[PDB]
Design a protein around this ligand. Structure first.
Ligand SMILES: Cc1cc2nc3c(=O)[nH]c(=O)nc-3n(C[C@H](O)[C@H](O)[C@H](O)COP(=O)(O)O)c2cc1C
Ligand SMILES: Cc1cc2nc3c(=O)[nH]c(=O)nc-3n(C[C@H](O)[C@H](O)[C@H](O)COP(=O)(O)O)c2cc1C
Lengths: 109, 104
């Protein structure tokens, strides 16, 4: 299904890997999204308290699961059930982050 | 949940990334699997015809979805619903394979 990998060691933690399900989910091409921060999926109705929560889980470098409003390339509004997981190397060094994305409406339970 | 990514530019197509779900699923640590080809999950009652199928999809550089007996570290049997996906670069060269696993 849908997942991405970001590189926090790079400027602004860009997406550096994107699965086919993620492209299908967002209506974006892999060219369009590699090198960018995932925040591009956010828009007007997106709750900032939730974004701050994501900002906080990333700062602390801990995993989390949230539900926030995202937008496809064509402007379609969806609940993104978003799970983050930090990844450290063999010496406890943060190397990446991973994200698994779900359409919350397709998965209300 | 469970996903690995492999590099087919490197010899023996090793696992270069693994999600925690795959760690939890297979009972291995990230250390024990990075740099290794995912075939170590295979074992004695694993269908070799299913293995040749995977090996075909990899050579053909196309996606497949198969199901096969795999083994956790402690030697526990599970039916692995395995989906593979080839990944090219912008100029069309094969750069990665990704895999999603399900306990069937
Ligand atoms: C691995 C990973 C995947 C992410 N996926 C999404 C996503 O699918 N949708 C979204 O709105 N934000 C996603 N984010 C969060 C944004 O990339 C960003 O971290 C968040 O908006 C906080 O950044 P900001 O407050 O500076 O804008 C993801 C973050 C990470 C680390
Ligand atoms: C990304 C990826 C993930 C894979 N995951 C598994 C797996 O979970 N279980 C398994 O038995 N084989 C898995 N394989 C297949 C083996 O790594 C290998 O391709 C298969 O054994 C055929 O190669 P071989 O005949 O040379 O061993 C995966 C392959 C790739 C490319």
């Amino acid at each position: 299904k849908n997942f991405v990998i970001t590189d926090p060691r790079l400027p602004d933690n860009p997406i550096i890997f994107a699965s086919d399900g993620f492209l299908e989910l967002t209506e974006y091409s892999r060219e369009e999204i590699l090198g960018r921060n995932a925040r591009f999926l956010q828009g007007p109705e997106t709750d900032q308290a939730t974004v701050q929560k994501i900002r906080d889980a990333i700062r602390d470098q801990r995993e989390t699961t949230v539900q926030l409003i995202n937008y496809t390339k064509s402007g379609k509004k969806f609940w993104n059930l978003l799970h983050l997981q930090p990844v450290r190397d063999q010496k406890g060094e943060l190397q990446y982050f991973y994200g698994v994305q779900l359409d919350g409406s397709d998965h209300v339970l």
